[PDB]
Amino acid sequence: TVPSIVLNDGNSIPQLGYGVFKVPPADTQRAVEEALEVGYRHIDTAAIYGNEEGVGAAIAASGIARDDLFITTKLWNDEPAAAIAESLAKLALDQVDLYLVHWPTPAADNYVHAWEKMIELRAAGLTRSIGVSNHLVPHLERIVAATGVVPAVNQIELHPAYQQREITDWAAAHDVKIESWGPLGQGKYDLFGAEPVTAAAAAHGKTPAQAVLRWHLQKGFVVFPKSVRRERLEENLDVFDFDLTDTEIAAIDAMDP
Ligand SMILES: [Cl-]
Ligand SMILES: [Cl-]
Ligand SMILES: [Mg+2]
Ligand SMILES: [Mg+2]
Numbered sequence: 360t361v362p363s364i365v366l367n368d369g370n371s372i373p374q375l376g377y378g379v380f381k382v383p384p385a386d387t388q389r390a391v392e393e394a395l396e397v398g399y400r401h402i403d404t405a406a407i408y409g410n411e412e413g414v415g416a417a418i419a420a421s422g423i424a425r426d427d428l429f430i431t432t433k434l435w436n437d438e439p440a441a442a443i444a445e446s447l448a449k450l451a452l453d454q455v456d457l458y459l460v461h462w463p464t465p466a467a468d469n470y471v472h473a474w475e476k477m478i479e480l481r482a483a484g485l486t487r488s489i490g491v492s493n494h495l496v497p498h499l500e501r502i503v504a505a506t507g508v509v510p511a512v513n514q515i516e517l518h519p520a521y522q523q524r525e526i527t528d529w530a531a532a533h534d535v536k537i538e539s540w541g542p543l544g545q546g547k548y549d550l551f552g553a554e555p556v557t558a559a560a561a562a563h564g565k566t567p568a569q570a571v572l573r574w575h576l577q578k579g580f581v582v583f584p585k586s587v588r589r590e591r592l593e594e595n596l597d598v599f600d601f602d603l604t605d606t607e608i609a610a611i612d613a614m615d616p
Contacts, residue, residue, distance in 0.1 A: 360599060361400065364581060366511045367534045370488050372457065373429050374576060375596065376401030378583035379414065387413025388420075395421050397592045401429040403583045404446075408435065411449035419451060431457040431583075433492065433514075439476050443485045458486035459514055462493035470494070474502040474510075490514065492540070496529050503533075514538040517580065519555070519571065519614035520548055531579070538581040543571055555610035563601045572598045574611050 363371040377399035382390045384407075391402060391414050400423070404411050411432075418428065432455055434442045439460055447454065460477060463470035477489040490512030491498070503509050513530055515523055517539035530537050544550040551557070551567035559570040568584075575582050576598060584595040603611075 360398070361596075362599070364536055364579070366488055366536060367509055368488055368511050370456065370511070372488075372512075372536070372581065373399075373401035374581055375399075375572075375598070376403050376429065376431065376581070376583045377592070378403045378406055378585040380406045380585035381587045382407065382413075384410040384413060387411075388416040389413075391417035392421065393589060394586075394592060395423065397589070398596055399592075400427060401431065401583075403431040403433075405431070405433040405435070406585065409442075409446065409449070411446055415450040415452065425452075429457070430455045431459075433459040434461060436461065437472075437476065439473070440480055440483075440485070443480055447485065454484055455486045457488045457490060457512060459490045459492050459512065463495075463498050467498075470498055471502055471505050474506055474508070478506055478508050488512070490538075494526075496525055499529060499533075499535070509533060510535055512536045512538050512581065514540050516540045517575070518542055518544045519550060519553070519574070519611050520544060522612070522615045524615075527578075527580075536581055537579070538583070539575050542575055542582045542584060543568060553614060555607070555614060558610065559603055559607045562607070563603070565598070565601060566594060569594060569598050570603070571611075573601065573603055574608060577603055577608060 361373045361375050364374050377394035404414055460473050480486055481489050488511040491510045492514040494513050513535050527537050556567045556570055560567045586592040586595050
């Protein structure tokens with residue numbers, strides 16, 4: 360099953376979650392109920408852009424203890440507070456488990472302020488944990504030095520061809536968990552056809568997608584494979600029954616230059 364990762368604030372998070380994806384608002388409830396039945400307990404609603412009413416309905420009708428669920432969401436575009444408050448209403452929840460704000464600005468003149476706001480959100484109990492996205496080592500050092508609060512999570516683009524090692528190393532050194540955004544390259548390159556990928560799939564009797572997912576997992580990363588078809592939901596979840604060897608992992612790691 361899905362292992363629970365330790366967050367720096369005392370909370371634990373299921374390593375693999377369901378990313379609500381490609382679902383019109385009316386079918387959202389049904390989709391989440393399906394993920395719940397499959398076995399997912401970690402839900403990420405980012406991709407639905409605030410169309411969370413259906414998510415709330417599913418949770419409410421699920422029968423699952425609040426404490427057994429992990430609700431994640433992110434602010435896309437002074438407004439995290441307004442944003443989260445609205446989401447809470449839609450979700451019919453007192454708080455979410457994890458809240459993340461957007462990539463720092465090219466102007467880099469507000470990410471600190473943004474972090475201060477997140478800290479207040481947390482203090483206000485709107486979210487149990489606070490994290491960031493696309494924060495580089497310098498961004499991270501800056502917010503920590505400025506606020507004294509270390510993010511629980513840092514969401515960054517991550518896949519074999521692009522690993523952002525500086526970030527992951529730093530994170531590991533400071534107890535920050537990494538969430539792999541676009542874990543499978545987003546179909547931008549031939550990931551499934553890569554020798555290191557096919558080789559692992561073949562050896563373990565898994566699919567290439569599965570092998571890659573496993574790679575992230577063994578590396579200690581948090582992932583939200585964006586599933587649509589039940590078949591995929593299933594496969595995406597069934598990646599805890601095998602282990603890539605150290606050699607298998609290194610071959611994949613070598614995919615980046
Ligand atoms: Cl709640
Ligand atoms: Cl992807
Ligand atoms: Mg340090
Ligand atoms: Mg070993």
